[PDB]
C-alpha cells in the first residue's frame, strides 16, 4: 500500500536510531560475553522453531535483550531468564497465538520458575519503558523485497537467512543499524542467487549505496563464508528446510566484486 510505504519507512528510520542498543555494552558486562550471547540467541532460534514463531518475533526478542543488557548487568546463570522473558514479550507483541507461560518455563528445562519468568517480564518491561515496537532487520528487508524484478523466493529466503545470522554475533553486528544490515543482506542474497546487485530504486528510497553498505557487507560476506564452521548452527539447520527453500544449502560467492 504505497500510500503509507514512504511515511512508514521514514518513521522506522527514525525509530531504529532511538531503539538502538549501546554498541559496547559487552565490555561493561562483568560475567557474560559475546559467545554466551551467541549461545542464547542460537537457542532462541530453536525455541522459535519448536513453537513455529514468526521470524519477526525472534528479531524483536533479540532487540529487547540487547537493550536490556545495555543497562542491566546480569549473571551468567540468569542470561537465559532474560532471554526467556524477552521471547515471551516478543510473542505477546507479535504472535497471533503466543505460546503460554508454562511453555516458556518448560523450554528452559525448569531452570526457572513461572514466577521468575513473570517477574523478569515486568522488569524487562520496566527497563525498556514499554517501548516494544522496535524496528528489525526483518521489517526493512520485507520493504526492500518489493523492489525485486521480478520477485524471487530464493533471494527473499537467503536475505532472511543472512539477516538471522547477524543476530548471533554482537561483534561486529551491534555496530550496524537494522536498515543497513538489511541492505547488505538483500544485496548479498541477490548477488548470490541472481548475480544482480543493490538496485537503484533502493538507492533512491534509502539513500544507501553499495559504497555505504560496504563495511557491513564485508563482515556479512565473511560471516556467510564461515557459517559452516561457526559453533552455532541452529540458523543453518532451520534454513535447510523447504519453508525457506533450503537456502542455507546454497554456496556463497567467493568474491563480491567491489
Amino acid at each position: 500500500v504505497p500510500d503509507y510505504h514512504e511515511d512508514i519507512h521514514t518513521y522506522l528510520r527514525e525509530m531504529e536510531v532511538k531503539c538502538k542498543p549501546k554498541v559496547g555494552y559487552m565490555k561493561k558486562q562483568p560475567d557474560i560475553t559475546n559467545s554466551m550471547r551467541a549461545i542464547l540467541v542460537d537457542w532462541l532460534v530453536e525455541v522459535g522453531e519448536e513453537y513455529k514463531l514468526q521470524n519477526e518475533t525472534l528479531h524483536l526478542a533479540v532487540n529487547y535483550i540487547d537493550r536490556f543488557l545495555s543497562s542491566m548487568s546480569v549473571l551468567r546463570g540468569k542470561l537465559q531468564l532474560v532471554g526467556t522473558a524477552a521471547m515471551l514479550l516478543a510473542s505477546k507483541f507479535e504472535e497471533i497465538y503466543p505460546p503460554e507461560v508454562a511453555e516458556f518455563v518448560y523450554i528452559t528445562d525448569d531452570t526457572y520458575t513461572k514466577k521468575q519468568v513473570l517477574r523478569m517480564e515486568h522488569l524487562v518491561l520496566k527497563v525498556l519503558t514499554f517501548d516494544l515496537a522496535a524496528p528489525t532487520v526483518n521489517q526493512f528487508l520485507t520493504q526492500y523485497f518489493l523492489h525485486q524484478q521480478p520477485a524471487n523466493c530464493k533471494v527473499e529466503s537467503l536475505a532472511m537467512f543472512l539477516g538471522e545470522l547477524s543476530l548471533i554475533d554482537a561483534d561486529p553486528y551491534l555496530k550496524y543499524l537494522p536498515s543497513v544490515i538489511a541492505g547488505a543482506a538483500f544485496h548479498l542474497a541477490l548477488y548470490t542467487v541472481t548475480g544482480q546487485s543493490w538496485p537503484e530504486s533502493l538507492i533512491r528510497k534509502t539513500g544507501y549505496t553499495l559504497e555505504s553498505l560496504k563495511p557491513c557487507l564485508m563482515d556479512l560476506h565473511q560471516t556467510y563464508l564461515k557459517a559452516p564452521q561457526h559453533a552455532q548452527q541452529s540458523i543453518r539447520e532451520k534454513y535447510k528446510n523447504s519453508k525457506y527453500h533450503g537456502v542455507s544449502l546454497l554456496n556463497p560467492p567467493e568474491t563480491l566484486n567491489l
Binding site: 554466551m36 549461545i39 537457542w43 546463570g77 542470561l79 537465559q80 523450554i107 528445562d109
Partner: peptide, 6 residues
C-alpha cells in the same frame, strides 16, 4: 534445554 546453568 538449560544453557549457562549446571
Amino acid at each position: 534445554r538449560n544453557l549457562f546453568g549446571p
